[PDB]
Design a protein around this ligand. Structure first.
Ligand SMILES: [Zn+2]
Length: 209
């Protein structure tokens, strides 16, 4: 876990680092004056590297505190607050995604060749799903509730979307039957689906080092 925490947090901080520049920063003389506890991205990045976070909750609390200071120092209605709010949301979203499936999260960030084809445990349910404007594309189910399913599509972008349950078909349905445009992109996604299914059958699990 401690090794995993390190690499996962590094992925998140790296992503949080850029949308954090735009930049005139919380180093006014009044920063001392309005802000209780000090923190910035470099401090967080150091704490990640030195293994200072005991849990993801402690990391999240530092991200929250950074948001709180920005709000206090610039005002809740300020544009700096808007940006910092989006930063915090994005950070917490990554933590959500990590919790959803650690293996998906690692592969999605590290992106080795054919990253989306490696199996997870438990295996993700596979479906055909259509979005408004599109025909059916193959996808992995990440989670679901009664009236909708959270999927990540095969192919370009590997688009993440909520799909109404009525727009889902079992992966065992015959492709030729239902509606979709057989574009090059769609065929590429179907190839990726098949390669994923082959890796599953092979027991070809992702191996680091
Ligand atoms: Zn997964």
């Amino acid at each position: 876990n401690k090794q995993e925490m390190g690499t996962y947090l590094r992925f998140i901080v790296s992503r949080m680092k850029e949308r954090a520049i735009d930049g005139k920063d919380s180093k006014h003389p009044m920063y001392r004056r309005l802000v209780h506890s000090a923190v910035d991205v470099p401090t967080i990045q150091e704490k990640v590297n030195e293994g200072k976070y005991r849990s993801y909750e402690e990391f999240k609390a530092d991200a929250q505190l950074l948001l709180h200071n920005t709000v206090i120092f610039y005002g809740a209605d300020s544009e700096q607050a808007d940006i910092a709010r989006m930063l915090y949301k994005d950070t917490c979203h990554e933590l959500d995604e990590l919790q959803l499936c650690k293996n998906c999260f690692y592969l999605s960030n590290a992106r080795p060749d054919n990253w989306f084809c490696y199996p997870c445990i438990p295996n993700h349910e596979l479906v055909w799903a259509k979005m408004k404007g599109f025909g059916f594309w193959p996808a992995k189910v990440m989670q679901k509730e009664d009236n909708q399913v959270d999927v990540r599509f095969f192919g370009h972008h590997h688009q993440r979307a909520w799909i109404p349950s009525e727009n889902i078909q079992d992966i065992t349905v015959n492709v030729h039957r239902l509606h979709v445009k057989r574009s090059m992109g769609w065929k590429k996604a179907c190839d990726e689906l098949e390669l994923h299914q082959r890796f599953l059958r092979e027991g070809r699990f992702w191996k680091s080092k």
